[PDB]
Amino acid sequence: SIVEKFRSRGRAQVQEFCDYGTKEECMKASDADRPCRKLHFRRIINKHTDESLGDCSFLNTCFHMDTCKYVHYEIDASMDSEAPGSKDHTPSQELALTQ
Numbered sequence: 273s274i275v276e277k278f279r280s281r282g283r284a285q286v287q288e289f290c291d292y293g294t295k296e297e298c299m300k301a302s303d304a305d306r307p308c309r310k311l312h313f314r315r316i317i318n319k320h321t322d323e324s325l326g327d328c329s330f331l332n333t334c335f336h337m338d339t340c341k342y343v344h345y346e347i348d349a350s351m352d353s354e355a356p357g358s359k360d361h362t363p364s365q366e367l368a369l370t371q
């Protein structure tokens with residue numbers, strides 16, 4: 273695990289790539305048991321399910337949440353700049369779920 277020695281000094285010149293620096297090859301290794309630092313985007317995926325089941329379409333709005341069958345592809349990474357005011361966020365100051 274020498275690549276860890278590079279994450280230990282924190283050299284800025286190392287923030288220009290991961291272990292090797294491949295476009296499609298490292299991607300396959302981004303979320304697999306392949307070398308690399310394993311620290312690349314952690315996204316959850318499921319086997320190709322028949323989309324006739326529900327639909328979700330997370331691409332924008334999930335509509336009904338009760339669905340969320342196996343179709344879903346989301347990435348987890350630090351928080352971005354995040355727009356100010358976040359008006360694109362529905363209100364929910366109440367702790368209890370409205371119903």
Ligand SMILES: [Zn+2]
Pocket residue numbers: 290291292293298301302308309312
């Ligand atoms: Zn990598």
Ligand SMILES: [Zn+2]
Pocket residue numbers: 328329330334336337339340341344
């Ligand atoms: Zn969903």
